[PDB]
């Protein structure tokens, strides 16, 4: 529900609106079906729709030295 609070409408409040039916998952993944405001959703595990903050890629420091 775009641009509404989870009041008037397994409920996840995002800045894109009130998302109902998607499980909020702490693990990030590559973006699949974009929702907005950093949140994407996908169908995964038994399977269900999940919502998560998308990953921007793996973290990799460079072994920089003089």
């Amino acid at each position: 529900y775009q641009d509404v609070n989870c009041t008037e409408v397994n409920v996840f409040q995002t800045r894109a609106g009130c998302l109902i039916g998607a499980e909020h998952v702490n693990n990030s993944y590559e973006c699949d079906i974009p929702i907005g405001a950093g949140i994407c959703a996908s169908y995964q595990t038994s399977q269900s729709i999940i919502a998560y903050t998308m990953s921007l890629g793996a973290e990799n420091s460079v072994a920089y030295s003089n």
């Binding site: 775009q2 641009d3 800045r15 894109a16 973006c31 974009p34 929702i35 907005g36 405001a37 950093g38 994407c40 998308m54 921007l56 890629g57 793996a58 973290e59 990799n60 420091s61 460079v62 072994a63 920089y64 030295s65 003089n66």
Partner: protein
């Protein structure tokens, strides 16, 4: 017979500011054309798909703003991070790298850029898919890659190289002999650091520097204000307020007055959507230009003249801005011009000689060979020059002497 060779340089950081996206507006046209009115809605259905192709056109614009923003920023397969120690040979990126003290971890110069830029009628504003905190992880990844690994993170995985060896590589890219860096490394580090200092003075003092991004935000706000104001027009109807028509006239007459309002509001929405489709092409061509500058200037070094601001391009650092990007393009500019007599070729033992690299020049009594971009005279030898043909062919050749490094080794 005269060539000017500059005996010194200045390193100039020029800001280039580019729109990259615009506000993802979307309008429930069936609410804008007919608000909470069943009688009006049933009449609007007689126009078929004139609504759903406008819901569709605006959705196409809204979806591609994240395409633009992804293509410009997400040019990196990994989120690279800077080392704990800042051992960059004297260069000082602390004003363009993240500030861990902030809630959204923008750089110092990204905070200046985020400071200088400033409904009920079916209108909405959809959020971007990349939050301005995720854009700042991508520009920090592009930038921590650029600093620690040069172009190599664009070709493969990031290969570390010391920053004094990365700039020595970029000086060879502009044809300046890389020892011109090491022999001047503190001067070059200090001119980079001082030139980054001027960026803060510019962006802090002069709000008009952001003129392109504020223009894009103003055009989108002016179009929405025009669209909302156009609800107040009668278009030939007895009233612009739909409820006042319905509360006063029976259907056989109310429908006529309503059709007048429907025609006017529908044409007035098509005008907005057509303007936004043309304005979205104007931003999409700017996102593709920003994506191209990201790929060629940041992930690389550009041989294209004036592509990365005035000067010979050395490197660029991306910073984010509200609905845009900013490139801090670092360029070598040759500065202290000097005058010399010059020769196309030199004559020695009947042979003509030409410089493998550099220009034959004369301060007025002696002849030297030297790189074109930085006065650095060399005694002329068989190692700086090659023989081809003889004296009787070149126009404007000069009868100097060319030294042989082997002779004294066999003479002694």
């Amino acid at each position: 017979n005269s060539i000017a060779i500059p005996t010194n340089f200045t390193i100039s950081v020029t800001t280039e500011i580019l729109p990259v996206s615009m506000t993802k507006t979307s309008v429930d046209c069936t609410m804008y054309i007919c608000g909470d009115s069943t009688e009006c809605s049933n009449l609007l259905l007689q126009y078929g798909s004139f609504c759903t192709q406008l819901n569709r056109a605006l959705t196409g614009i809204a979806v591609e703003q994240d395409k633009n923003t992804q293509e410009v920023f997400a040019q990196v397969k990994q989120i690279y991070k800077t080392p704990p120690i800042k051992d960059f040979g004297g260069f000082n990126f602390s004003q363009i790298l993240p500030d861990p003290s902030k809630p959204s971890k923008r750089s110092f110069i990204e905070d200046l850029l985020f400071n200088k830029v400033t409904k009920f009628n079916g209108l909405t504003v959809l959020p971007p898919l990349l939050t301005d905190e995720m854009i700042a992880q991508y520009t920090s990844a592009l930038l921590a890659g650029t600093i620690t690994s040069g172009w190599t993170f664009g070709a493969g995985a990031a290969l570390q190289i010391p920053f004094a060896m990365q700039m020595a590589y970029r000086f060879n890219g502009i044809g300046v002999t890389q020892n011109v860096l090491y022999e001047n490394q503190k001067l070059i580090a200090n001119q980079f650091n001082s030139a980054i200092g001027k960026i803060q003075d510019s962006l802090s003092s002069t709000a008009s520097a952001l003129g392109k991004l504020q223009d894009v935000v103003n055009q989108n706000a002016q179009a929405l204000n025009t669209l909302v104001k156009q609800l107040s027009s009668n278009f030939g109807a007895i009233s612009s307020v739909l409820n006042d028509i319905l509360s006063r006239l029976d259907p056989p007459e109310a429908e006529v007055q309503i059709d007048r309002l429907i025609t006017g509001r529908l044409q007035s929405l098509q005008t907005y959507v057509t303007q936004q489709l043309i304005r979205a092409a104007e931003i999409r061509a700017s996102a593709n230009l920003a994506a191209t500058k990201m790929s060629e200037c940041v992930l690389g070094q550009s041989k294209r003249v004036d592509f990365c601001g005035k000067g010979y391009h050395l490197m660029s650092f991306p910073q984010s801005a509200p609905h845009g990007v900013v490139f801090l393009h670092v360029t070598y500019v040759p500065a202290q011009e000097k005058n010399f007599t010059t020769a196309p070729a030199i004559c020695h033992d009947g042979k003509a000689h030409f410089p493998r690299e550099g220009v034959f020049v004369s301060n007025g009594t002696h002849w030297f060979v030297t790189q074109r971009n930085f006065y650095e005279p060399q005694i002329i030898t068989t190692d700086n020059t090659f023989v081809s043909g003889n004296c009787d062919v070149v126009i404007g050749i000069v009868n100097n002497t060319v030294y042989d490094p082997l002779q004294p080794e066999l003479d002694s």
